[PDB]
Assembly symmetry: D2
Homo-oligomer: 432 residues x 4
């Protein structure tokens, strides 16, 4: 499974490669300490929430264990039609989903356009394009605290009013009879969308993981009653884990230029928005003076190109060296292309190992893994659109869980921020 | 200034008294360390606010340095009529204040009655009693964070909506044309009410202190621009200071039964809501078996009785031993009445010393005390309705500030939660 | 197993008893959090030692995981004669032990007398009393750090020289040809003495526990090679555990008068030197005014009397109320004697539960408990000389380890500070 | 005082220079926060020592405030001859000093050679070379804790015995009648040597500073009696200050490769053993691809070359570009030599500013600076053998102390580890 060298490599470049690979090496002895720290942090977060479920106090637990206020999960037997709003950065979409009683979802369109007074006409605009004249979901990936499932406040980016009723009154100002009923997170929607579209002869899903341009997790905590939680599903803020991470110096520099400094140190090692910069810096270090002038720019390499480099099988890597030219205007030789492959294979492997040791921790906090069986729905831009990264995540997950790997199933879910919010708004209302 | 014994005291009781007095003794060497810790904490809080002015992170600074979003202070030259709402616990009042251009306030009534749908009719009910048919202030002493001067959220006790517009729409639902325009704290209103009613030949006020059933402070920070503050007045959450306090064991037990545990340890040593319990516990310890059966109850002694015991000049203390009987159904002898006086004189003296060392710290953070002169407006139930406590606070304040005591003036302000909110709503609107 | 009341109890005293019993109640839900915190602390201590095995850094781990520098444990097959020195406080002993090859120890005398220049003549004085004219052990329970097995430094109480060679040169100054070869702790000697005198058909011993006027533990860590330890046996400083303890307010006051303040909070809840004060304070609180004048003294009740109260079976508790009079000069009635019994039964039960949850943690860090079997040697003044405390410790230990209680055996060892140091000095030398 | 550019610089290289200079910029607003943090840390260290003067607890204070056990300082009126031993790394010296009663020292030799059994013959070997046949000092720069002035223990590098008597018995084994009487630090010897050789018309010295291949400080604390100190001079472990430092990313990487990781972060920014690496890394970053192959080696540039670059006045910098070739085998052009000068001038200026703000803090803890006058003796390899670094340290020290700069005098002391230990051994013995 490891890259093999046949071309004669210089001594200096080989020494540099060997020195910079052992800075990204994750042995099966550190992964156990990682799993233990993760489980302990989960438990401490639960207790600290029970002590004061309103404010999040750092230095008590890195995970701000949020709670979706949902009542119960779906089973794949409902029916209707429901609409959902996604709102991230500059331009995002609107979803319409039809639900039959057989565990299947039908979706129509994801319209993008470049301000609460615009979205009501947007919903009427997509609705007239179906003209079958209720309740609408909402994702709203922004800094918000949700005391209840219907409302959530805004504390960052009228910038401070209720972001729920703000959207609600735009339907009243217009003709549209549709009300907001849920403000879900990106991962709980993933959990629900995976639970719906499973089937009937599959174990229940208990963990929803997002690995993409951001990393997060939600899971079903059976002891939710012993603490003060109202929903059966708990949203871990997984990206903020900082107990003991194997940080190389490149991770110490790339964090200083972050504009989010000293925050979210676990997300900056495994997420797809940061792997391109890691491999760029490592390549600059290993090709000291031979590096081009473009290899010193900031955003000169993103993870979509690492995906191209990893999934390469040509006799001569004419695709792996065509992605070099258009990014770094440089004609790579054989030793340099070998170095590039050996660096990407290390960075992505570390990401996959650390993201596989965070699923075993969740599956170990739930003490079901000993006897019963259950499933996990993994979604994201790193899991999809990458083949070398799936069979590696599931290889590490098959070694962390030594004798129990067969009890935990992986089911790739799709489109959490969409179908998820629609299914949540359908469940919270049809079963209201 | 110290109590003198002439009656022959038993040896055991004298030993116990001497042992329990030295547990409440504050020497002029510890007060300096206190002042230094306080000043350092103020500076650290300012910096930590500049780093992230949204969330309060404990273990960065005990003071959550809030900010009133006011523009500028009054001078005593405005005019009009304005109404204010107070809302604490079970039953609180409504205020109407007339303002002339000479630094004088005229107030009408403080009606009490035992639920946002009731207060609009309350305001119309007080208004019809003057029938001179704008803007209304609001104090709202509850857990709230205020991103702006007009709005504030509710996170504790619809329990979560906007507590500003909640009150505002009740005037629209009714006929009353009055809108909320400010949600002030108990101490910034004190500052403003003191600034208004000063005169013309007095130094400017810079600190507003509340010492009562609760302790708090607000002050004018001249470096407000260097950090991200929008108002010239900063609200210290002074009650939460916990750096290094001289805690006796009685303070360790009375905090365990608090229902606010491990929070606000500086407020539980100096505020008027906790001195009665302190003196009750100390009396139980010094009168071991001679204590009555009522001296073991919880709320059997409040600070209004300590005020009676302190301000006593009768030949035979027939008032200090009449407050004993009706509270602890017991006929005190001479040694016991001496012990009671010597215990109250120690508890209240420690409170006064620690509250005088917290004014010197604020007056030292403002570096004006070296050359110029300014004033401080002290308000509360301990300052008013107690004579032994004023000339003692100002005795300690005259020894902490060795050569500068003449630069700082004390001006007793009155009724902060009332006239304060009215004057703030008048200034924010007439000078809008 | 619980005390039963038949005599009619007053309402007030019954309310007070019920209120003060629930402050000492340990449910089987908190014991699990205790075990988890203990195991995590053990692991963190091991890692922190590997990072810097010289200085102990608090806030890294409460346990300063010391190391005995022993080579290997005995098996009960050696032979010879060896001498040991004990040195605690004012007056302590000297031991002579003969060792045959069958797992049996023969001891002679423990002489007490009320200064390194005296102990050599003491050893010659005990030796002449046997006149069979090598190597001598040493316990030396004082503040000392031991870089090697032969030497240890002194940092508290020439007060600072080498406390090993100090004793060694006194044998050279005299005629005695005996040299110090080991400075062991009170618990590793217990471990060795238990390992020797086991037999041949018993599982191996792995934990040595001391529960007396002080609490401590040592255990065999199989992963000693992965970290920088030279001995197979690790000395936990178990008394300093302070992660999350169920502290009543009486424990908050009794710690303030400690002269060892904010240090060793786990030892002050379970050790035999502190249970008498706990029960004295609780009795003062429950018998508010009926308490005598002697119940307010400090050392008016020690654990030897609680042992007498617990192990009482007379028809009328003429022994449990005879221990009252000579200690508190008071003729207890029936309700008061019931209260006293119900208070001692709670204090000692909490101690036994918390000391049984600290053995399960050690037995869980060693992952052998799943399949194999092993033993633990418990010694101390609370285990011996108390019958109600053994069958209660082993009742809680049979419920903490649900399905594995049969894998762990309890073997009461005796005289650790004696036979232990002798056997260690014999093993380190005969097998040198 | 700033470098001026006249040669036309490229746009890219100019942008890089301007971007990397503002990462080393120290404004007069941060220096005040630095001084405040330093003073607070000093006070906290003093208190924490008073609470437990035996063990050093980090997270209480970064400064382990050690204490020299000296009685009193010299005045320059003694007489005699005394010998001193220095012992650092591989090869170090022996000193002989003659002392007259006029404040003048006469020194003979510093012999170097490449093991306590060798130093006695070394002392006899230097003594026979003067053949004027008492007491000997000792510096011994190694990890050691000194409970008393005569003895000190060894805990790192027989490796653990008494390093005082170890040297003492070598004089008895030989003929030499010379005994060790003091084990001083590198900075207290500097203080004493400065105090001796002052004169008679100079203010008293109170601070001794070492700025070289290591940074440290000692000072006279007038409140030494209020705490448990026996000597009037306190040894700050100044290099370990880590409260809030302006760390660039280069300092984050150079610390990861330290072998002393997460320890002594203030020493790694200002000391002469680390400035060459800083400027090397910055030069690699600013000359991205134009850098040579030798500029990527580790020890390719030490501070002796930065001293050469700074003190350059030739028309064409034929010395500043001759130090480039022999170190980095590269013919620098004009833009590159300008960049090199502008980088060294920034690194050394930051070091000088931060080392000048640490003298103002010490001079501010002693409250004498307000009225009286005193002096400070600065020694080290950065102060001596560098002219641009003295008039810059004293320029920053003249701006930090706004109105008091004339009260504090700087007196360059010489050879602390030598004359210092001799003078200390002379004072401790002649005035014994």
């Amino acid at each position: 499974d490891t890259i093999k060298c046949d071309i004669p490599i210089n001594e200096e470049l080989q020494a540099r490669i060997n020195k910079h690979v052992n800075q990204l090496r994750i042995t099966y002895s550190t992964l156990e300490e990682f799993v233990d720290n993760f489980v302990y942090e989960l438990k401490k977060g639960l207790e600290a929430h029970r002590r004061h479920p309103n404010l999040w106090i750092p230095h008590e637990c890195s995970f701000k264990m949020l709670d979706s206020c949902i009542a119960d999960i779906p089973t794949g037997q409902e029916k209707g039609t429901y609409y959902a709003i996604d709102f991230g950065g500059t331009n995002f979409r609107a979803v319409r989903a039809s639900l039959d009683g057989n565990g299947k979802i039908k979706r129509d369109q994801e319209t993008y356009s470049l301000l609460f007074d615009h979205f009501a006409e947007r919903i009427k605009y997509i609705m007239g394009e179906f003209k079958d004249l209720k309740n609408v979901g909402f994702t709203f990936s922004f800094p918000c605290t949700s005391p209840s499932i219907n409302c959530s406040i805004l504390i960052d980016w009228v910038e401070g009013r209720d972001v729920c009723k703000l959207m609600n009154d735009a339907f009243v100002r217009s003709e549209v009879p549709a009300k907001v009923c849920c403000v879900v997170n990106d991962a709980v929607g993933t959990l629900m969308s995976c639970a719906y579209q499973k089937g009937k002869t599959t174990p229940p899903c208990y963990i929803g993981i997002i690995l993409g341009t951001g990393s997060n997790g939600c899971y079903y905590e059976p002891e939710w009653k012993k603490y003060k939680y109202s929903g059966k599903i708990i949203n871990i803020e997984l990206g903020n884990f900082d107990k003991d991470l194997p940080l190389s110096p490149i991770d110490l520099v790339m964090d200083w230029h972050s504009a989010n400094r000293s925050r979210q140190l676990f997300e900056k090692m495994i997420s797809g928005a940061y792997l391109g910069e890691i491999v760029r810096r490592f390549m600059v270090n290993v090709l000291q003076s031979a590096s081009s002038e473009k290899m010193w720019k900031s955003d000169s390499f993103n993870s979509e190109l690492g995906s191209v480099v990893l999934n390469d099988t040509s006799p001569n890597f004419e695709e792996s060296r065509k992605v070099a030219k258009d990014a770094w205007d440089m004609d790579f030789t054989d030793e340099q292309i070998y170095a590039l492959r050996k660096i990407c294979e290390s960075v992505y492997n570390r990401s996959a190992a650390l993201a596989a040791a965070a699923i075993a921790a969740i599956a170990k906090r739930i003490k079901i893994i000993e006897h019963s069986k259950f499933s996990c729905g993994v979604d994201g831009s790193l899991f999809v659109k990458n083949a070398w990264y799936c069979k590696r995540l599931q290889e590490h997950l098959k070694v962390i869980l030594a004798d129990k790997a067969e009890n935990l199933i992986i089911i790739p879910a799709d489109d959490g921020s969409g179908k998820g919010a629609a299914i949540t708004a359908a469940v919270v209302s049809q079963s209201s």
